[PDB]
Amino acid sequence: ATIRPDDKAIDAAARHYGITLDKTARLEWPALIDGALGSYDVVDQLYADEATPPTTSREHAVPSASENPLSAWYVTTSIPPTSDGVLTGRRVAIKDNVTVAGVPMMNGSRTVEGFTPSRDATVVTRLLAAGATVAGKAVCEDLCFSGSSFTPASGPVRNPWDRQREAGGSSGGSAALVANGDVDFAIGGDQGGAIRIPAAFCGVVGHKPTFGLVPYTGAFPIERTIDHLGPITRTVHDAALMLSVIAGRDGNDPRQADSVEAGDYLSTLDSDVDGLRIGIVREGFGHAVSQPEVDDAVRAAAHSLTEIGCTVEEVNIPWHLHAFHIWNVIATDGGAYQMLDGNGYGMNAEGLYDPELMAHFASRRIQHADALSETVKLVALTGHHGITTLGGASYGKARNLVPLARAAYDTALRQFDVLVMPTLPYVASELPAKDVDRATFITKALGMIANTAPFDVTGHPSLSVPAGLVNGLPVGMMITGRHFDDATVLRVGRAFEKLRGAFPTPAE
Amino acid sequence: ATIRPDDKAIDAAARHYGITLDKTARLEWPALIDGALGSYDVVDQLYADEATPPTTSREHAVPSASENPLSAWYVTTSIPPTSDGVLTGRRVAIKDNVTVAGVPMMNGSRTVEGFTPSRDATVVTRLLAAGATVAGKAVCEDLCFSGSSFTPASGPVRNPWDRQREAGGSSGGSAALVANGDVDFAIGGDQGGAIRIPAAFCGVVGHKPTFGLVPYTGAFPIERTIDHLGPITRTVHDAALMLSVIAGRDGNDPRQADSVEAGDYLSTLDSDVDGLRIGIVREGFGHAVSQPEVDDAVRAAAHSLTEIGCTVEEVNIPWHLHAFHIWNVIATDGGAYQMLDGNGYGMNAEGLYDPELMAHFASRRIQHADALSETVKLVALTGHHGITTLGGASYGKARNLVPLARAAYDTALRQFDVLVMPTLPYVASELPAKDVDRATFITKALGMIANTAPFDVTGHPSLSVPAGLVNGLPVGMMITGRHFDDATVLRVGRAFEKLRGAFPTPAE
Ligand SMILES: NC(=O)c1ccccc1
Ligand SMILES: NC(=O)c1ccccc1
């Protein structure tokens, strides 16, 4: 039977809604609530007899500090493919916010550490059926609300290019492992740039596909309308190969529209880009907070594409700066409402839920809230203000502005094939000391998402490709295009790779 | 600029998440939260300069007790059509939970009374462009969480067949007006049976279309996955005519899938039903709480269809009883989470929001929570328990069971064209005294949704058609069919009408 609430809880519930119970109310509600909970009892029973996922027996190990030099691994594994395919012989690291049945996961947070899922996320299942070997779970920022790599409760991920500098984030671990050569590919998540940012910082390729293309099923949600799963690879070709395996509706993710279909990211990957219009978004350069050397390197990189027949011109998209603030509201109000109060999955959406995870997270986060990262706490405090005092109006206003933001980019996309700008306005900085300032902490973890975040809310596919080195550190060029035109975005990235030439390895 | 929270609020927010602020935290957060709110300021500005709906000048009047004999009207109007069409010369009443720009609305609740929307719901706009004249707003149950007609803060709606008995609900007012002949049609909402129930009680036709067919845009939400808007009419033909005008994607309702398309509900409305298989769902009859006279009348009505070439057989669908409990969890946890904590619209879904309404509702419901109906309070208390203590797990479990419920009905629908059972297990009962028992109140307002509610969660189109009189009071036969096969559901309803013959008017 489902647990019933006690009188103290009933009173707390009533006070939550501003309801005042008299003496007779406090006496009757219990029995009534108990009657209502009768349906919950039935759901509990039906769920136990019909929707309880099977058990799993897979092995894993906590690597020793020696076999985990960058602190990029949470746990290691060797899960064999179920069929041979285009990934046979390759290894893949899975971001810790993504479930792998029978394997522990914590999503870089103390509020989740200790959870062992019963289901494999859809992308995990597709990877295995393509011949890949899942090599383990890669550490991710505390509940992923961080653009750097110092919020993981298990410690900071070191960049393989400079073990003193950040690996980025929130998929810091994934990129590090890929850059360091520990795995061939990695599955990363992107809500404000978590796939593109660490890739840029670690000198690897990161693709946040068109929203809804890759099923999110099985990954810990943050805010439903901006959740993205995607590939982090060493090369554009591999990124396209991974996408061909993971893309496509799975019938369990409400984010995916009925019309979603996997495109062809390989057939024309190497086709010439002669005649393609490349738009350099002005608002993507010269931010108050930035390193000009970085912007110029990427700017030069963008223009060099003329060397292969591309017409390159600058274009103004004022809404690019507006989109950031619209994203921030959606991520702040939405994140606190869903990720926290809704315990990850939230409610009011059709699809496959993870009630085991929801329960686990619910208890742990209230007993370890103080351990939550400073950025998550910021989201919590201000979002709660947005949800209650503000009545959710700001979230509503932001939602009503999204179409305008989308249209602003699509208009530019009628004049250009793809839009380009620096992925990040600066190279990986040194890791802060575990004595950091709350204010510094929040600015150093959220000040590099200005160009990436906008595309999370509008949903356009956005790709980060290494564009060169600045003071020995990797910088990235971000190529963004039309919804579901991931193929063209990848083609341009590929074409740029050929022109740019082989990009150095942190081991080189 | 967006209102900032004070230290007391910041502390309350922190306590809400189990976060404990020290002395320095209480000192720093303010400035940080203020910085975060900077994005809200920008959203506020952009929204004011670009997404603020125009002003409106329409007239309305509060009818006198004399011109509002059944207490079915909230306010009356005479909004002329914008174009001539299939509804020219007809009047339509709009349920009070549905916005009509420039006109007051309260959704039968004290927590909303006083609100005047700036946008017209999509169905309102479509009705006007089809030649209809909007005659006013029809009273609906307190926040619609009631299957009867005694929860409206403005008083109970009297059934035109017996002004001492309930008109049903939550669209009680709409059905009453239609039955009484005050209007030709009405737009009603259905979350647990609000369109079908009052129609059945008042002897009129009520159609809860396939989920997602009719845009919900502009109507006050309860729980996103079970929200439905539909027509309430005097005849099946009119119901089909209305559906042809309101059905179809509007690009603003996240509930509507990309593949949704309006069907043809008129071409074959009068075609012969010779050979159609009609399945009498056993679990839809003989409930512990019910009036056998009612079940037999409907049972006999269902069999009479053989008189026109239909093959009629009984079929077992055990999941019909399970679906009720699955619905209850989704409506209880989901309703408290979205309708209350989310102030109607909630979050984490793409679409057109009503931030003005969200703000208004947010302030009013905390100052008038004690005025909320007993059923809403039940939802509030137990749902809050589900959201917090239960961690939302029950909601998740219920969601994971929905497909099985859907499949159970679809399997029956492979053996039969449509499924039939009584809309309600009993005729309209006498109105309770404003001295009612909380327990009685909750059972008398929620004990008649056993057959209707299941279809709200699975989404199948479900139609209630008058099947006869029992002790002088109307009883209804509910015809339910496949997703988006509203046309066949209507055809059967039509065919039954012809056979049954003209149904008496409460004025006859
Ligand atoms: N990289 C991300 O997805 C991110 C999300 C939220 C805040 C910062 C970064
Ligand atoms: N008729 C309805 O939609 C309803 C919803 C909730 C509870 C009772 C009835």
CSV table of N, CA, C and O in Angstrom, one decimal, chain A residues 211-273:
chain,number,residue,atom,x,y,z
A,211,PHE,N,16.8,19.8,-31.6
A,211,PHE,CA,16.0,19.4,-30.5
A,211,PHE,C,15.0,18.4,-30.9
A,211,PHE,O,14.3,18.5,-31.9
A,212,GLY,N,14.9,17.3,-30.2
A,212,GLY,CA,13.9,16.2,-30.5
A,212,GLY,C,14.4,15.1,-31.5
A,212,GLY,O,13.7,14.1,-31.6
A,213,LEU,N,15.6,15.3,-32.1
A,213,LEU,CA,16.1,14.4,-33.0
A,213,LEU,C,16.5,13.1,-32.3
A,213,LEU,O,16.1,12.0,-32.6
A,214,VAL,N,17.4,13.3,-31.3
A,214,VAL,CA,17.9,12.2,-30.5
A,214,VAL,C,17.0,12.0,-29.2
A,214,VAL,O,16.8,13.0,-28.5
A,215,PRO,N,16.4,10.8,-29.0
A,215,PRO,CA,15.6,10.7,-27.8
A,215,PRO,C,16.3,10.9,-26.5
A,215,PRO,O,17.4,10.5,-26.3
A,216,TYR,N,15.7,11.7,-25.6
A,216,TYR,CA,16.3,12.0,-24.3
A,216,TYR,C,16.0,10.9,-23.3
A,216,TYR,O,16.6,10.8,-22.2
A,217,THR,N,15.1,10.0,-23.7
A,217,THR,CA,14.7,8.9,-22.8
A,217,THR,C,15.8,8.2,-22.0
A,217,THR,O,16.7,7.6,-22.6
A,218,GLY,N,15.7,8.3,-20.7
A,218,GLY,CA,16.7,7.7,-19.9
A,218,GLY,C,17.7,8.6,-19.3
A,218,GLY,O,18.5,8.2,-18.3
A,219,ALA,N,17.8,9.8,-19.8
A,219,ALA,CA,18.7,10.8,-19.2
A,219,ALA,C,18.0,11.7,-18.2
A,219,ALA,O,16.8,12.0,-18.3
A,220,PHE,N,18.7,12.1,-17.2
A,220,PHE,CA,18.1,13.0,-16.1
A,220,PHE,C,17.8,14.3,-16.7
A,220,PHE,O,18.6,15.1,-17.2
A,221,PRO,N,16.5,14.7,-16.7
A,221,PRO,CA,16.0,15.9,-17.2
A,221,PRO,C,16.4,17.1,-16.4
A,221,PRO,O,16.7,17.0,-15.2
A,222,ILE,N,16.4,18.3,-17.0
A,222,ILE,CA,16.6,19.6,-16.3
A,222,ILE,C,15.4,20.4,-16.5
A,222,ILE,O,14.7,20.8,-15.6
A,223,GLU,N,15.1,20.7,-17.8
A,223,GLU,CA,14.0,21.5,-18.2
A,223,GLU,C,13.6,20.9,-19.6
A,223,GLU,O,14.4,21.0,-20.6
A,224,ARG,N,12.5,20.2,-19.6
A,224,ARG,CA,12.0,19.5,-20.8
A,224,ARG,C,12.3,20.1,-22.2
A,224,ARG,O,12.7,19.4,-23.1
A,225,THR,N,12.0,21.4,-22.3
A,225,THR,CA,12.1,22.1,-23.6
A,225,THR,C,13.5,22.4,-24.1
A,225,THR,O,13.7,22.9,-25.2
A,226,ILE,N,14.5,22.2,-23.2
A,226,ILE,CA,15.9,22.5,-23.6
A,226,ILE,C,16.8,21.3,-23.4
A,226,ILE,O,18.1,21.4,-23.6
A,227,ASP,N,16.3,20.1,-23.0
A,227,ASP,CA,17.1,18.9,-22.8
A,227,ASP,C,17.6,18.3,-24.2
A,227,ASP,O,16.8,18.1,-25.1
A,228,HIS,N,18.9,18.1,-24.3
A,228,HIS,CA,19.4,17.5,-25.5
A,228,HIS,C,20.5,16.4,-25.2
A,228,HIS,O,21.2,16.6,-24.2
A,229,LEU,N,20.5,15.4,-25.9
A,229,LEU,CA,21.6,14.3,-25.8
A,229,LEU,C,22.2,14.4,-27.2
A,229,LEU,O,21.6,14.6,-28.2
A,230,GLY,N,23.5,14.2,-27.2
A,230,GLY,CA,24.3,14.2,-28.5
A,230,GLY,C,25.6,13.6,-28.4
A,230,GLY,O,26.1,13.2,-27.3
A,231,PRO,N,26.3,13.5,-29.5
A,231,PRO,CA,27.7,12.9,-29.6
A,231,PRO,C,28.8,13.9,-29.3
A,231,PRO,O,28.8,15.0,-29.8
A,232,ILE,N,29.9,13.4,-28.7
A,232,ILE,CA,31.1,14.1,-28.5
A,232,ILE,C,32.2,13.2,-29.1
A,232,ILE,O,32.3,12.0,-28.6
A,233,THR,N,32.9,13.6,-30.1
A,233,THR,CA,33.8,12.8,-30.8
A,233,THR,C,35.1,13.5,-31.1
A,233,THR,O,35.3,14.7,-30.9
A,234,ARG,N,36.1,12.7,-31.6
A,234,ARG,CA,37.4,13.2,-32.0
A,234,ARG,C,37.3,13.9,-33.4
A,234,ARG,O,38.0,14.9,-33.7
A,235,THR,N,36.4,13.4,-34.2
A,235,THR,CA,36.2,14.0,-35.5
A,235,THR,C,34.8,14.2,-36.0
A,235,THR,O,33.9,13.6,-35.4
A,236,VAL,N,34.6,15.1,-36.9
A,236,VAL,CA,33.2,15.3,-37.4
A,236,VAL,C,32.6,14.1,-38.0
A,236,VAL,O,31.4,13.8,-37.8
A,237,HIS,N,33.4,13.3,-38.7
A,237,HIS,CA,32.9,12.1,-39.3
A,237,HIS,C,32.4,11.1,-38.3
A,237,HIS,O,31.3,10.6,-38.4
A,238,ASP,N,33.1,11.0,-37.2
A,238,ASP,CA,32.6,10.1,-36.1
A,238,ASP,C,31.3,10.6,-35.5
A,238,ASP,O,30.4,9.9,-35.1
A,239,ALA,N,31.3,12.0,-35.4
A,239,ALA,CA,30.1,12.6,-34.8
A,239,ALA,C,28.9,12.3,-35.6
A,239,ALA,O,27.8,11.9,-35.1
A,240,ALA,N,29.1,12.3,-36.9
A,240,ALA,CA,28.0,12.0,-37.9
A,240,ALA,C,27.6,10.6,-37.8
A,240,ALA,O,26.5,10.2,-38.0
A,241,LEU,N,28.6,9.7,-37.6
A,241,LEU,CA,28.4,8.3,-37.6
A,241,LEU,C,27.5,8.0,-36.3
A,241,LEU,O,26.6,7.2,-36.4
A,242,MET,N,27.9,8.6,-35.2
A,242,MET,CA,27.2,8.4,-33.9
A,242,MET,C,25.8,8.8,-34.1
A,242,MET,O,24.8,8.2,-33.7
A,243,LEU,N,25.6,10.0,-34.7
A,243,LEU,CA,24.3,10.6,-34.9
A,243,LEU,C,23.4,9.6,-35.7
A,243,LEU,O,22.2,9.4,-35.4
A,244,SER,N,24.0,9.0,-36.7
A,244,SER,CA,23.2,8.1,-37.5
A,244,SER,C,22.7,6.9,-36.7
A,244,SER,O,21.8,6.2,-37.1
A,245,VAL,N,23.4,6.6,-35.6
A,245,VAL,CA,23.0,5.4,-34.8
A,245,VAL,C,22.0,5.8,-33.7
A,245,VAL,O,21.1,5.1,-33.4
A,246,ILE,N,22.2,7.0,-33.1
A,246,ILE,CA,21.3,7.4,-32.1
A,246,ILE,C,20.0,8.2,-32.4
A,246,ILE,O,19.0,8.2,-31.7
A,247,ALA,N,20.0,8.9,-33.6
A,247,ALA,CA,18.9,9.7,-34.0
A,247,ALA,C,17.6,8.9,-34.3
A,247,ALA,O,17.7,7.7,-34.6
A,248,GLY,N,16.5,9.5,-34.1
A,248,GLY,CA,15.2,8.8,-34.4
A,248,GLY,C,14.3,8.7,-33.2
A,248,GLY,O,14.7,8.4,-32.1
A,249,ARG,N,13.0,8.8,-33.5
A,249,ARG,CA,12.0,8.7,-32.5
A,249,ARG,C,12.0,7.3,-31.8
A,249,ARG,O,12.4,6.3,-32.4
A,250,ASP,N,11.7,7.3,-30.5
A,250,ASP,CA,11.6,6.0,-29.8
A,250,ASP,C,10.3,5.8,-29.2
A,250,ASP,O,10.0,4.7,-28.6
A,251,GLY,N,9.4,6.7,-29.4
A,251,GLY,CA,8.0,6.6,-28.9
A,251,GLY,C,7.9,6.7,-27.4
A,251,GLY,O,6.8,6.5,-26.8
A,252,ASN,N,8.9,7.2,-26.7
A,252,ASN,CA,8.9,7.3,-25.2
A,252,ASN,C,9.3,8.8,-24.8
A,252,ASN,O,9.1,9.1,-23.6
A,253,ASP,N,9.7,9.6,-25.7
A,253,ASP,CA,10.2,11.0,-25.4
A,253,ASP,C,9.2,12.0,-25.9
A,253,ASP,O,9.2,12.3,-27.1
A,254,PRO,N,8.4,12.7,-25.0
A,254,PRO,CA,7.5,13.7,-25.4
A,254,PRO,C,8.1,14.9,-26.2
A,254,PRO,O,7.4,15.6,-26.8
A,255,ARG,N,9.4,15.0,-26.1
A,255,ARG,CA,10.1,16.1,-26.8
A,255,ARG,C,10.1,15.9,-28.3
A,255,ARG,O,10.2,16.8,-29.1
A,256,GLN,N,10.0,14.6,-28.7
A,256,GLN,CA,10.0,14.3,-30.2
A,256,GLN,C,8.7,14.3,-30.9
A,256,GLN,O,7.8,13.6,-30.5
A,257,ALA,N,8.6,15.2,-31.9
A,257,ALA,CA,7.4,15.4,-32.6
A,257,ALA,C,7.2,14.1,-33.6
A,257,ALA,O,8.1,13.5,-33.9
A,258,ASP,N,5.9,13.9,-33.9
A,258,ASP,CA,5.5,12.8,-34.8
A,258,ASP,C,6.3,12.8,-36.1
A,258,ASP,O,6.6,11.7,-36.6
A,259,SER,N,6.6,14.0,-36.6
A,259,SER,CA,7.3,14.1,-37.9
A,259,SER,C,8.8,13.9,-37.8
A,259,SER,O,9.5,13.8,-38.9
A,260,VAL,N,9.4,13.7,-36.6
A,260,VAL,CA,10.9,13.5,-36.5
A,260,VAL,C,11.3,12.2,-37.3
A,260,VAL,O,10.7,11.2,-37.1
A,261,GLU,N,12.4,12.4,-38.1
A,261,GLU,CA,12.9,11.3,-38.8
A,261,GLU,C,14.4,11.5,-38.9
A,261,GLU,O,14.9,12.6,-39.0
A,262,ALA,N,15.2,10.4,-38.8
A,262,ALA,CA,16.6,10.5,-38.9
A,262,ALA,C,17.0,10.9,-40.3
A,262,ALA,O,16.4,10.4,-41.3
A,263,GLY,N,17.9,11.8,-40.5
A,263,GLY,CA,18.4,12.2,-41.8
A,263,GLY,C,19.6,11.4,-42.2
A,263,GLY,O,19.9,10.4,-41.6
A,264,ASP,N,20.2,11.8,-43.3
A,264,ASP,CA,21.4,11.1,-43.8
A,264,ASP,C,22.6,12.0,-43.6
A,264,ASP,O,22.8,13.0,-44.3
A,265,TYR,N,23.3,11.7,-42.5
A,265,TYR,CA,24.5,12.5,-42.2
A,265,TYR,C,25.8,12.0,-42.7
A,265,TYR,O,26.8,12.6,-42.5
A,266,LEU,N,25.7,11.0,-43.5
A,266,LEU,CA,27.0,10.4,-44.1
A,266,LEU,C,27.2,10.5,-45.6
A,266,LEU,O,28.3,10.8,-46.1
A,267,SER,N,26.1,10.3,-46.4
A,267,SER,CA,26.2,10.3,-47.8
A,267,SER,C,26.8,11.5,-48.4
A,267,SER,O,27.7,11.4,-49.3
A,268,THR,N,26.4,12.7,-47.9
A,268,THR,CA,27.0,13.9,-48.5
A,268,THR,C,27.9,14.6,-47.5
A,268,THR,O,28.2,15.8,-47.6
A,269,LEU,N,28.5,13.9,-46.5
A,269,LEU,CA,29.4,14.5,-45.5
A,269,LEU,C,30.6,15.1,-46.1
A,269,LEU,O,31.1,16.1,-45.7
A,270,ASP,N,31.1,14.5,-47.2
A,270,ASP,CA,32.3,14.9,-47.9
A,270,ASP,C,32.1,15.7,-49.2
A,270,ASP,O,33.0,16.0,-49.9
A,271,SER,N,30.8,16.0,-49.5
A,271,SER,CA,30.5,16.7,-50.7
A,271,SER,C,31.1,18.1,-50.6
A,271,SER,O,31.3,18.7,-49.5
A,272,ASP,N,31.4,18.7,-51.8
A,272,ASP,CA,32.0,20.1,-51.8
A,272,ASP,C,31.0,21.1,-51.3
A,272,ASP,O,29.8,20.9,-51.5
A,273,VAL,N,31.5,22.1,-50.6
A,273,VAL,CA,30.6,23.1,-50.0
A,273,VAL,C,30.7,24.4,-50.9
A,273,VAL,O,30.5,25.5,-50.4
